[PDB]
Design a protein around this ligand. Structure first.
Ligand SMILES: *[C@@H]1O[C@H](CO)[C@@H](O)[C@H](O)[C@H]1NC(C)=O
Lengths: 362, 338
């Protein structure tokens, strides 16, 4: 058994979580081979070269990341070759087969908390790197329900004038008398945005700030805490269950000399998705061995397309993210997302979002 | 060779760095330092160190003291007829054989509060530099019928600071006057932002000589009015020459060669220059007090009690583009505005 990897540059916590998942899920009966690579997912040529190199040595399954400018290439290559590609990246739009997806969809929850809080005429600050897949839904919902959106494109900003531009955005919104904004950017961006918020002020009472990036316990809220402004967010990894407590008990023990990181109390959601991917993949091959069951990329399907794809897509397990069970397409179907809000005290649970019931308050 | 004594305490590493800089550059009548650094500034260790320095033989001691150990050091210096040049906080009353380089901030602060014409404000203070400022403020408030709420913040933690700030927010004060140490002032400034008071409507008065030595960029962007004092002049070619030569030395022995000097470093350098002038004049106590020199902090001259006279200090206000000088304070001409 061999299982490759196309992990991106600038990411080290994810690969540390990957090796920790390798160590934790001990398998004497069979052992896989990582053969990990490293490159910039934003460049298509390197991605194609690495994919071809992995395919040239008969890898059974590949596991890596991508972005908006490289998802189509991966999807097209995996469709023709029947090689499954497990990814904790953003959910793709449309039925793309043979791409197992291990991230819940933010959409639907941001539209169920924006109505539990009865609002209208809100502000929305989107980024043009993740993709125009969440803003479009917001525009559609606003058109359907007569809401008024004020879209602002954060990102694609020069670092020299990043402070000035971010400050000027809030200064301009002050003129229009807008007090509700919806921030949805990666941790690096949202940290800078909230820092500039605090620099201008706006952390006094009378302002409500939703973070729409899952997580919400890894953006250093200590700066924005102990103020008057409201803070609300979504969370996927609850930090009080038996499994997560057992994980964090051994998380701090390992040192950064061999395993980078692993000394802080909180872990990013992407690394948790990677660690759960390790388990769901090992158990997927376990089920096949219980059932007793290549040339160049520029050349025919290989031996076992369905035997691997359907087996990996029919898994039912429980991990840090919660229930893990995939539907026909490969997206999560039985996921629950915790609702949290920030007070003078740390984050407190407010409810949960699920498919079976729209919105729950507790 | 002329023997000099050096006494320093903890958390004053830049003081020792400036002293070593002054000694090195002045000698390169070579001075002979007798530095004996002490960790805790208590009476017993200071007395023992002074005894050792005196027994080895010293003509003048440059030392630093705090509230607790000032009395013993001054008493022994007056008793043994050994001149002591110090940059610490000035004392009150008659004092002999003690030279003090730090000017008193009482007059300038009183003139500033007179200029803005305030009748109710909050005064945050600590007792690390005596009770002179608090007593002067209370006397002036009693004479002029003011309303001051002095609060001691010596033993306050973050929770206490935030709760006190919220309680003072409940009342309408809107005007604060801070007088504490550098670290305490930094803590106050980093916890006043979290509450959200770095906004237009408040007017803080930083009462020290290090207005440009602290980072106020957050207040600059906020727009809240801030007024402070400055003693060291940066456009003089003398300070630029000294600072460039500081850059030309290594950083493994003289750290701080990347920033303009604070008030204490300039004070120590001026004290070293005054002491060297005193020795050179003596080559050809009474002679010590007759010195008149041009140091980094301007004109240096002392009266019969060793206090500063004929000293100029600029007053700065925080604007959108940064600090902007608005005038200067002098003893003979009081406050002068531009
Ligand atoms: C903050 O939360 C409280 C309690 O839910 C709510 O009444 C208030 O309107 C919120 N403020 C803003 C600015 O949304």
């Amino acid at each position: 058994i061999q299982i490759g990897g196309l992990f991106p540059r600038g990411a080290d916590q994810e690969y540390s979580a990957f090796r920790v998942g390798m160590v934790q899920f001990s398998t004497s009966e069979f052992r896989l081979t990582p053969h990990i690579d490293n490159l910039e997912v934003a460049n298509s040529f390197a991605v194609t070269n690495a994919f071809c190199s992995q395919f040239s040595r008969g890898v059974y399954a590949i596991f890596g990341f991508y972005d908006k400018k490289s998802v189509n290439t991966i999807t097209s290559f995996c469709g023709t070759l029947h090689v499954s590609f497990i990814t904790p990246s953003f959910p793709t739009d449309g039925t793309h087969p043979f791409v197992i997806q291990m991230r819940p969809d933010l959409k639907g929850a941001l539209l169920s908390l924006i109505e539990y809080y009865q609002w209208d005429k809100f502000a929305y600050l989107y980024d043009s790197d993740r993709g125009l897949s969440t803003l479009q839904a917001v525009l559609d919902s606003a058109a359907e329900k007569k809401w008024q959106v004020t879209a602002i494109n954060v990102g694609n900003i020069n670092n020299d004038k990043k402070d000035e531009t971010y400050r000027s955005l809030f200064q301009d919104l002050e003129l229009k008398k807008e007090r509700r904004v919806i921030l949805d950017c990666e941790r690096d961006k949202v940290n800078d945005i909230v820092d500039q918020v605090i620099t201008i002020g706006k952390h006094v009472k009378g302002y409500h700030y939703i973070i729409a990036n899952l997580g919400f316990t890894d953006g250093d809220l200590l700066k924005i805490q102990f103020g008057g402004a409201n803070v609300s967010g979504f969370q996927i990894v609850d930090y009080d269950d038996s499994l997560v407590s057992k994980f964090i008990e051994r998380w701090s023990t390992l040192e950064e000399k061999e395993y980078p990181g692993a000394h802080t109390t909180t872990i990013k959601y992407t690394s948790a998705l990677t660690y759960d991917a390790v388990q769901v993949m090992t158990e997927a091959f376990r089920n096949l061995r219980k059932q007793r069951i290549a040339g160049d990329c520029l050349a025919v399907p290989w031996g076992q397309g369905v035997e691997i794809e359907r087996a990996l897509k029919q898994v039912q397990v429980e991990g840090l993210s919660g229930n893990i069970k995939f539907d026909q397409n490969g997206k999560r179907i039985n996921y629950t997302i915790n609702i949290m809000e920030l007070k003078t005290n740390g984050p407190r649970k407010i409810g949960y979002w699920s498919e079976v019931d729209k919105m729950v308050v507790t | 060779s002329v023997q000099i004594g050096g006494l320093f305490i903890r958390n004053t590493d830049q003081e020792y760095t400036a002293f070593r800089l002054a000694i090195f550059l002045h000698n390169t009548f070579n001075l002979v330092p007798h530095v004996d650094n002490i960790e805790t500034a208590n009476s017993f260790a200071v007395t023992n160190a002074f005894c050792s320095q005196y027994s080895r033989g010293v003509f003048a001691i440059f030392g630093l003291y705090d509230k607790r150990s000032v009395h013993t050091l001054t008493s022994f210096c007056s008793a043994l007829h050994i001149s002591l040049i110090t940059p610490s906080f000035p004392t009150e009353g008659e004092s002999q054989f003690v030279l003090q380089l730090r000017p008193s901030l009482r007059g300038a602060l009183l003139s500033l509060l007179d200029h803005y014409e305030w009748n109710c404000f909050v005064f945050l203070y600590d007792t690390d530099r005596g009770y002179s400022i608090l007593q002067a403020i209370m006397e002036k408030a009693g004479q002029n019928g003011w309303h001051v709420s002095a609060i001691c913040v010596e033993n306050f933690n973050d929770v206490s600071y935030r709760q006190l700030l919220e309680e003072l927010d409940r009342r309408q004060e809107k005007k604060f006057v801070i007088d504490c140490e550098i670290e305490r002032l930094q803590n106050i400034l980093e916890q006043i932002v979290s509450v959200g008071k770095h906004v237009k409507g408040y007017h803080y008065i930083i009462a020290n000589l290090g207005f440009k030595d602290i980072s106020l960029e957050r207040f600059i962007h906020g727009g809240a009015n801030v007024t402070g004092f400055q003693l060291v002049d940066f456009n003089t070619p003398m300070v630029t020459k000294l600072m460039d030569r500081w850059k030309k030395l290594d950083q493994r022995e003289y750290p701080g060669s990347e920033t303009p000097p604070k008030y204490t470093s300039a004070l120590t350098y001026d004290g070293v220059l005054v002491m060297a002038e005193t020795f050179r004049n003596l080559r050809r106590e009474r002679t010590l007090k007759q010195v008149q020199i041009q140091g980094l902090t301007g004109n240096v001259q002392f009266d019969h009690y060793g206090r500063r006279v004929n000293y100029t200090m600029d007053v700065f206000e925080l604007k959108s583009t940064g600090p902007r000088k608005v005038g200067y304070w002098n003893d003979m001409d009081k406050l002068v505005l531009i």
